[PDB]
């Protein structure tokens, strides 16, 4: 359209992409965080690794990317690349193979009130420990520890959307069956550093079809 | 338009006429930048004895002093610390030399912390495939001395110092491996006399 072109031209004229999006400074951003599982690829009992396909829904507010719908042709939604906007560094702590950065080539979604919604997909190699003291009539518990990497509890505050993990679009495996997948929030303090860091822990309680 | 304190301060610090990330913060000629580093281990995920490759995720905490990144705190509404991406400021290129891959490149480019007096601190996360020799005379009742060797490929001792902060690596966040047992983690600062 013609009105979306002018709004996109106005929207990114002078936008620093490494300043954090708050009107005040002591105010922390609040990032709603939810994860969805597409399929469980494999869990190697020998190498003690776990390969999953995850979609990382991240929702936060942004005081600078809000506009008036009544002056831009009634447009309310925009798609911008993830290379232009600010975006948080959600990095899983217990990784075992490869780099930690999630791939940024997918596009975001701008509501007129500033709600940025970004859904990157990723292969993740968790490093959970597994006990084979019963075999093959065993239950196994593997955790994934999502959390921000550089920002404090006073600058990024994570909030879960749901109380569990969205298995709504889950491709069935045929070897492992997922019983439940809760999700918890912790505020822990490390011995490197003097400041509090938040994280979100997703457990997975699975059973082998024997 | 309406900007933050951090946007105004970010435009003032990393200014193209005043800051350049390829010249080191030496106030004069032949001044040694004293940096200090301290390794924090997280997990022994695997020790592959046939290919002689151990895998560890470690957290090397390294800090130095950069006199270009100083600001008066009370002028900019009050901001003690400030976080900036790693590619836009100067940093020494400390990597492993005894890694099994050819990846002497730096690890992933998470942003780093700089304080009000210019104390620049950086802790990037890295899994490393270190290469150590396996003493396999006794088996499976064996000790293993496996080493990690950090060194800057670009600069040298005539340009940067490299001070060890604590003698032992900190083991406080350590989750138990269940296959191996660490008994001690001594670190040393090695320099050859008659060889600057």
């Amino acid at each position, epitope marked *: 359209s013609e009105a979306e072109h002018r709004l996109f031209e106005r929207l990114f004229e002078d936008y620093n992409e490494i300043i954090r999006p708050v*009107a005040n400074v002591s105010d922390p951003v609040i990032i709603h965080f939810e994860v969805s599982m597409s399929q469980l690829v494999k869990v190697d009992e020998v190498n003690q690794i776990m390969e999953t396909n995850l979609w990382l829904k991240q929702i936060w507010n942004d005081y600078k990317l*809000k*506009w008036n719908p009544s002056d831009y042709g009634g447009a309310e939604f925009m798609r911008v690349p993830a290379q232009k906007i600010w975006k948080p560094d959600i990095v899983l702590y217990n990784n075992a193979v490869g780099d930690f950065q999630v791939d940024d080539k997918t596009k975001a979604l701008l509501k007129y009130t500033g709600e940025v919604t970004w859904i990157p997909p990723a292969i993740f190699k968790s490093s959970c420990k597994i006990d084979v003291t019963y075999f093959p009539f065993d239950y196994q518990n593997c955790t994934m520890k999502f959390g921000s990497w550089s920002y404090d509890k006073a600058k990024i505050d994570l909030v879960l959307i749901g109380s569990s993990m969205n298995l709504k679009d889950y491709w069935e495996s045929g070897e492992w069956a997922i019983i439940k997948a809760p999700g918890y929030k912790h505020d822990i303090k490390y011995n490197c550093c003097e400041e509090i860091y938040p994280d979100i822990t997703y457990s997975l309680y699975i059973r082998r079809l024997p | 338009r309406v900007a933050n304190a951090e946007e105004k301060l970010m435009d003032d610090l990393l200014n193209k006429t005043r800051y350049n990330n390829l010249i080191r913060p030496a106030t004069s000629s032949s001044q040694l930048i004293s940096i200090k580093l301290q390794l924090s281990l997280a997990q022994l995920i695997s020790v592959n004895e046939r290919e002689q490759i151990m895998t560890t995720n470690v957290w090397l905490k390294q800090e130095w002093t950069d006199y270009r990144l100083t600001w008066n705190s009370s002028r900019y509404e009050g901001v003690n610390i400030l976080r900036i991406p790693a590619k836009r400021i100067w940093l020494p290129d400390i990597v492993l030399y005894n890694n099994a891959d050819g990846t002497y490149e730096v690890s992933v480019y998470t942003n780093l912390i700089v304080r009000s007096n210019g104390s620049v601190l950086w802790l990037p996360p890295a899994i490393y495939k270190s290469a150590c020799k396996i003493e396999v005379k006794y088996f499976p009742f064996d000790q293993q001395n496996c080493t990690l060797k950090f060194r800057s490929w670009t600069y040298d001792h005539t340009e940067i110092d490299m001070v060890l902060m604590t003698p032992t690596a900190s083991m406080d966040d350590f989750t138990p491996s269940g296959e191996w047992d660490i008994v001690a983690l001594p670190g040393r600062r090695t320099v050859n006399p008659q060889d600057p």
Partner: antibody, heavy 117, light 105 residues
Framework: VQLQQSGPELVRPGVSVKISCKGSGYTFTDYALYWVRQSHAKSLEWIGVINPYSGNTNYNQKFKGKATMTVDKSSSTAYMELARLTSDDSAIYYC?????????????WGPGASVTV | QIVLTQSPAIMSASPGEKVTMTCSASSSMTYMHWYQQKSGTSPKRWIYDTSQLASGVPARFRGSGSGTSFSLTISSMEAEDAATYYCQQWSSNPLTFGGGTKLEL
């Protein structure tokens, strides 16, 4: 959509003054309030911006040590207090509410109070 | 940082005449707004984003410009078009208005 302000006031120089602006006919949050003075020569200047949902203020660098801008979420009313009044401040003061998106304009204007010092 | 200056200060025209007003800047910008104030009453939002029109505005007017020079143009002069026009920019901190152009018959 209406904005309502106070009447004209006669204040001696050296005494602080307070004027008000109360908006009705729309949701008072999610907009933002601009304060604009206008002298007798019809050359009008900008004073400050407040956000009535949080209270974050930005002043003009001419008027940083003078004006103090507050809101009140009970009655949905903003208060502006000027200090150090001199003879060069007898003007017309407007409050103006605009949307806080990329038009960044003054969508609605008040009647205007008259401060004579 | 940016101080606007209008030209001309006082001008006049007959009903049915092309009218051109200019607003100039110290440095470059891209988007600039125009407000209309009549006699006695309050101003109104009149032109935004250098080319667009507000709600209750007849479609005779046209704003155009770029760089450091902008202009408002009236094709058909109206009888009730006697007012004062201000140009203003928000692209540089702080918000500076214009000097004002008084258009009379």
């Amino acid at each position: 959509v209406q904005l309502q302000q106070s009447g004209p006031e006669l204040v001696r120089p050296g005494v602080s003054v307070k004027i008000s602006c109360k908006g009705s006919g729309y949701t008072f949050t999610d907009y933002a309030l601009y304060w604009v003075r206008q002298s007798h020569a019809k050359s009008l200047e900008w004073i400050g911006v407040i956000n009535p949902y949080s209270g974050n203020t930005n002043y003009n660098q001419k008027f940083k040590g003078k004006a103090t801008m507050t809101v009140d979420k009970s009655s949905s009313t903003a208060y502006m207090e000027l200090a150090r009044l001199t003879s060069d401040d007898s003007a017309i003061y407007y409050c103006a509410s605009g949307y806080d998106g990329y038009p960044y304009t003054m969508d609605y204007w008040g009647p205007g109070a008259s401060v004579t010092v | 940082q940016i101080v606007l200056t209008q030209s001309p200060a006082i001008m006049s025209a007959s009903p049915g005449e092309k009218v051109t007003m200019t607003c100039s800047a110290s440095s470059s910008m891209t988007y600039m707004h125009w407000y209309q104030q009549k006699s006695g009453t309050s101003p109104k939002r009149w032109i935004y984003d250098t080319s667009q029109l507000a709600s209750g505005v007849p479609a005779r007017f046209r704003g155009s410009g770029s760089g450091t020079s902008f202009s408002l143009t009236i094709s058909s002069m109206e009888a009730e078009d006697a007012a004062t026009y201000y140009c203003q920019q928000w692209s540089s901190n702080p918000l500076t208005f214009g000097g004002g152009t008084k258009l009379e018959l």
